[PDB]
């Protein structure tokens with residue numbers, strides 16, 4: 482099945498998932514000098530005060546911090562969005578080297594990693610229905626650069642030893658995702674897709690302009706995870722990013738000048 486290796490990586494995905502060559506695939510390069518300020522865009526509303534994290538899972542492709550999405554507890558609204566979108570999980574994509582790892586790029590610049598806070602439109606009732614809709618998901622993407630440590634990230638880092646291999650999960654309650662945000666909520670937005678199979682074209686992407694900084698030690702701990710299951714040959718979970726896809730008939734809008 483699919484992965485990020487030479488034989489099962491992004492250039493192969495179209496064979497099982499022909500939408501990989503579709504009209505609204507993600508990620509994309511964000512050309513800052515072609516993105517246009519849209520004054521009708523509204524400030525994002527990130528309401529994470531009542532967030533309930535439950536568990537962290539290594540799924541063989543990344544690790545996901547999962548939340549209770551059976552109530553409006555951690556929601557994203559505003560910006561380009563109509564309606565309320567509930568946080569279901571967050572995860573990251575990262576590199577083997579500090580100069581690569583993000584999915585989106587900015588004027589072709591790759592960041593060391595990229596955080597995806599995944600939310601689904603409550604008008605569709607559940608996440609499985611939402612992924613079948615063109616406005617089903619809103620993913621908030623945040624770039625990571627290597628510099629000073631991000632204190633908000635350390636409790637994620639310190640549980641990774643307990644989920645080294647595919648299929649391992651650990652309790653992960655009371656985690657505050659607000660500690661992963663940068664200061665500014667200025668953003669770019671465009672219509673796209675999931676960046677992994679099944680690559681469904683169901684995402685309003687909201688990518689923050691301001692990266693967060695994490696330490697070299699923090700990202701090194703991401704790179705000690707494994708794509709394989711326990712007792713299978715060890716393959717480090719690194720370079721789990723899809724490269725930029727053609728923008729096609731899309732415009733990227735900026736919330737700022």
Ligand SMILES: Cc1cc(C)cc(NC(=O)NCCS(=O)(=O)Nc2ccc(S(N)(=O)=O)cc2)c1
Nearest residue numbers: 547548549569570597599608620674675676677
């Ligand atoms: C059963 C249960 C319960 C709860 C709370 C959470 C979860 N976790 C969950 O549903 N995760 C979504 C993983 S996926 O849909 O299968 N594919 C997906 C692909 C790429 C992106 S990306 N990289 O475009 O952001 C985002 C998602 C599951």
Ligand SMILES: [Zn+2]
Nearest residue numbers: 572574597676
């Ligand atoms: Zn992602």
